[PDB]
Swiss-Prot record, chain B:
Highest rank taxon of the organism: Bacteria
GO biological process, one term: translation
Family per record: Belongs to the universal ribosomal protein uS5 family.
Species lineage: Bacteria, Bacillati, Bacillota, Bacilli, Bacillales
Protein name: Small ribosomal subunit protein uS5
Domain-level remarks: The N-terminal domain interacts with the head of the 30S subunit; the C-terminal domain interacts with the body and contacts protein S4. The interaction surface between S4 and S5 is involved in control of translational fidelity.
The keyword Ribonucleoprotein belongs to this UniProt entry's keyword annotation: yes
GO-annotated molecular function: rRNA binding; structural constituent of ribosome
Function: With S4 and S12 plays an important role in translational accuracy; many suppressors of streptomycin-dependent mutants of protein S12 are found in this protein, some but not all of which decrease translational accuracy (ram, ribosomal ambiguity mutations).
Curated annotation (Swiss-Prot), chain C:
Organism annotation: Bacillus subtilis (strain 168)
Superkingdom of the source species: Bacteria
Gene3D superfamilies: Ribosomal Protein S4 Delta 41, Chain A, domain 1, RNA-binding S4 domain
Quaternary structure note: Part of the 30S ribosomal subunit. Contacts protein S5. The interaction surface between S4 and S5 is involved in control of translational fidelity.
One cellular component (GO) term of this entry: small ribosomal subunit
The entry's keywords: Repressor, Ribonucleoprotein, Ribosomal protein, RNA-binding, rRNA-binding
Protein name (Swiss-Prot/TrEMBL): Small ribosomal subunit protein uS4
Coiled coil: none
From Swiss-Prot, chain D:
Entry keyword set: Antibiotic resistance, Ribonucleoprotein, Ribosomal protein, RNA-binding, rRNA-binding, tRNA-binding
Family annotation (SUPFAM superfamilies): Nucleic acid-binding proteins
Alphabetical list of InterPro entries matching this protein: NA-bd_OB-fold, Ribosomal_uS12, Ribosomal_uS12_bac
GO terms for biological process, alphabetical: response to antibiotic; translation
Species this chain originates from: Bacillus subtilis (strain 168)
Name the record gives this protein: Small ribosomal subunit protein uS12
Curated annotation (Swiss-Prot), chain F:
Originating organism: Bacillus subtilis (strain 168)
Oligomeric and partner information: Part of the 30S ribosomal subunit. Contacts proteins S5 and S12.
GO biological process terms on file: translation
Family in the record: Belongs to the universal ribosomal protein uS8 family.
InterPro entries reported for this sequence: Ribosomal_uS8, Ribosomal_uS8_CS, Ribosomal_uS8_sf
Name of the featured protein: Small ribosomal subunit protein uS8
Amino acid sequence: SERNQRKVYQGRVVSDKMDKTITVVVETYKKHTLYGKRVKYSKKFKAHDENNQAKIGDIVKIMETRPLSATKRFRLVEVVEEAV
Amino acid sequence: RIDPSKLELEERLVTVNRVAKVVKGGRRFRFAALVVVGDKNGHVGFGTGKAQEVPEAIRKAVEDAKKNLIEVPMVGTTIPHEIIGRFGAGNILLKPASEGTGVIAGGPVRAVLELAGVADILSKSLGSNTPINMIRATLQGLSELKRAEDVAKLRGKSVEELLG
Amino acid sequence: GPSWKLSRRLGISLSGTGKELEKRPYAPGPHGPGQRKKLSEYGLQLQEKQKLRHMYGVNERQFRTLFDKAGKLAGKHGENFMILLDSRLDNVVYKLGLARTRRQARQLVNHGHILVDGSRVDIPSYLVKPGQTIGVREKSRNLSIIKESVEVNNFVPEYLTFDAEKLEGTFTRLPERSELAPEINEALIVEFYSR
Amino acid sequence: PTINQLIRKGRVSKVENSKSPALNKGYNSFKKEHTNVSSPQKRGVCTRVGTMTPKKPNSALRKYARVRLTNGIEVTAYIPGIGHNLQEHSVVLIRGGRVKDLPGVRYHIVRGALDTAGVENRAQGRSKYGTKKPKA
Amino acid sequence: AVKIRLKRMGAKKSPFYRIVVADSRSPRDGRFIETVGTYNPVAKPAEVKIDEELALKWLQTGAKPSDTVRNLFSSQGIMEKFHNAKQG
Amino acid sequence: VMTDPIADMLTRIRNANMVRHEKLEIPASKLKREIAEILKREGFIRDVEFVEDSKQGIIRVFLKYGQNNERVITGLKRISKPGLRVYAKSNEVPRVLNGLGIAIISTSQGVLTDKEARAKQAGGEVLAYVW
RNA sequence: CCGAAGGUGGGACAGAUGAUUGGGGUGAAGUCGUAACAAGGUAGCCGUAUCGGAAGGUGCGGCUGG
RNA sequence: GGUACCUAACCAGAAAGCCACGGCUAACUACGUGCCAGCAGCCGCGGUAAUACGUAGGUGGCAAGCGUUGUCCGGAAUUAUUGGGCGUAAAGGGCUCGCAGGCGGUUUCUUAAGUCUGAUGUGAAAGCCCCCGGCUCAACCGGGGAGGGUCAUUGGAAACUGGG
RNA sequence: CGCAUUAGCUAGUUGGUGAGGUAACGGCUCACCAAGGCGACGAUGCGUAGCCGACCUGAGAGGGUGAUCGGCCACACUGGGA
């Protein structure tokens, strides 16, 4: 019996400046109720970096979790692509 | 072709306008009738007529209406396909309907579609409501209609290769 | 209810007989025997709608709800509405031949009781399904009005079968609208309630 | 326009203004504010009952009573039928009805109301103008 | 706690009862966990309809019916099946 | 610029109808080749031919005026414009002039027509009405 | 320690009301001109400045909707 | 609550009104009034021949209802996605350079976010809808089903949009 | 969901370590540091509003409503507390 799977995203680091954390822009993007065309929205999440192994402009996965502080509910999974 | 008018026709009228011309003396009036004419087997037409009187106007209108006749496909007592007729800021959509609906249409559109022999029409005027331009719009929408037999003959095809 | 007046205004024999239009075919009233003008589209649709609803004597609440329920059935719309008003039970009594009008057949269903498949029906607007043997109870077994309308012989329509003595009215498949009424123009009434 | 322009500015729907706004409000006494009640009829006390005239070609003297309401607003209402009971300080129930002839008047005094008596000598149009079915 | 209980449906003078697994806390016509079928009292005969296996499923997790629901279970015969299961 | 070439080939065919031209050169992308192949096999066209070249290629279209003066193609339309894309489920696939016209609808198994996509029961882009 | 209320204070928003005032609308054949519509009797209009009881005039630039 | 219900007796006896009638809008005449009284939703009636005012007759609409009002929605394609426009009717920024945004010529490989499709769960009960049943029919009740997600997980497709 | 004729808003606010507290994770509370956090994809502010299943209209898309019935919420003369 493998337990239930938590929500996962991939995104892009906005800031590094908070102590051991980052914020992450998920760019999933969707259409209207009325006009039907598909428009974009950027969702920035607070995510934990326990090693602080991040940079601004980094494609990264995040896992959701228990609330780690105020506004934090996410952590790192696999830092995919590094900034240049 | 030009439909030769030797049929039995029902010839009911939409409007007679009273229609003026100003002279040195003053206003001089005439009556401009437009009348829709056709049997209920698929031939429709309409015509304008002007005179000092009402009945001579209806005479000239029924004559000019018998001159110009049009044909309409009556596929299953309806029209074959939905169409918008657009003569000059009169725009009228026409849908085929089911067998119970009756002619759903406003006054002059209803006169065209009842004197056409078409029995089940959904329709709506999406433009100006003068009778003359609405009747021209209806007959524009009924001239551009297409028969399934004729379109099957047009595509180098057969009817059952269209209809299913 | 005069009900000659309704017929001569609507211009139709609503019984269907040489009465009520002979000697006076104009509409009613002080503006009637003069040459009346023809009616518009609205007037023609009203004439045909009220031809039908004054045949059957219906108020427009029941008449509209049967129009709607007939729309919920299949086929052609104005045919199905004719069929539903020819399943109406006053019409069943007057077309079995148990009354001379539909008012007398209304009083038969209302109080001078008549029975469907058993117990009773006190209600004129009862829609009669097929297969239903319609008769009278042993109390009103053969009394003077049903007795007269038995003495008088009308045709039984082919969507009915009717006995004289046993007096049970039984049915067939469905009343086809070719059989129902020649004079009432359906699908002007569909157009009247299309607006 | 274009779909992106419809997405970022939208279609702004046309403004709706009520034809009779003095009915379209209300009042509570201790809160000292002016609630939106949207009510069909309002009784108020007459502040001035006169008569005055329309503006242009139509020329016949109208009826013209001015009433202060229970929400607090004075509006000039109209007294429709022929010959009216009313005085100053009369209790009046007001329905919304525009009087095109006299300008500035957009309500009717309901005839048959709390104090506005039903009209005299009337047999056709019974319910309007308030009068009972007399006798026969 | 969890109780299989009747639940009122129907017109004014003509009641009807859906046999309904609810809590004692929840209102009578209100929220409920699952239902088994029905109960017509106002028929001049009988006519109860019980699901008879999902009702049995709720009886064993611990859900004690009310008196009329219990004797409806007895009429269809599920309390005998429950006693056979406890004797199993 | 050019912003979509499918709508431009549909207007090029429509303007060739209204002028009653007999030939069209169109710069021939692969979806244009499949559109003109569908309109060939449905009898809207006499014949279509490909000119494979270096620049981008040419597709030539031979418009069909079967009888006296009868535009077999009466009108064309593009449904999914680049700026409002249109996608239909298989129980929403549109049948046009109810049967007498057609809709080029590129589903997940090939750029299909109307009836083909309806009978294959898949949906995708809805990219031309052809009357 | 926290702490509701109350107290003091300086601001912010919102409604009334206010001598007086400024433009607006509508109204019984009121007074002064006649600016525009015709080449409207000085072609008109647009912007801007200026002057003048008032429409308006005049300058400059532009426009034909001469 | 001797309540629904059933059964017997008696008499047409106890039981119809409201609105409109110029057009839209079905339904018209007469008498009084005389730009007065008044009507009005609009067009607008009425200044001595008023089918528009008030009354009577009549007719028409409905019907234990009818009419007025107040608000919603339609009509209204009159906020136009479906489904409108900008030379002169309202409407092209005075014009440019350009950030964000939107849109993207061609061939091919690949990906699967969009798209389509399958399975699973779920979107309670009542409600709308379908099918039958019970109330004397109906309203209503009841049973059975359907419907509704850019929904989550999961599996196929690869034409197109996107990614590499 | 309405207003941009509301454009700047935060400072336990934004993170850290440690402690307390809680049925529990957590600036939920406190010490000490770091200068963070939200922002024209509309923060903040102001106005309005219980939300929904559903209800009315409409060909539909929609628009309006949130009575009854049913689910969740919040309230109990006003504010606070256990």
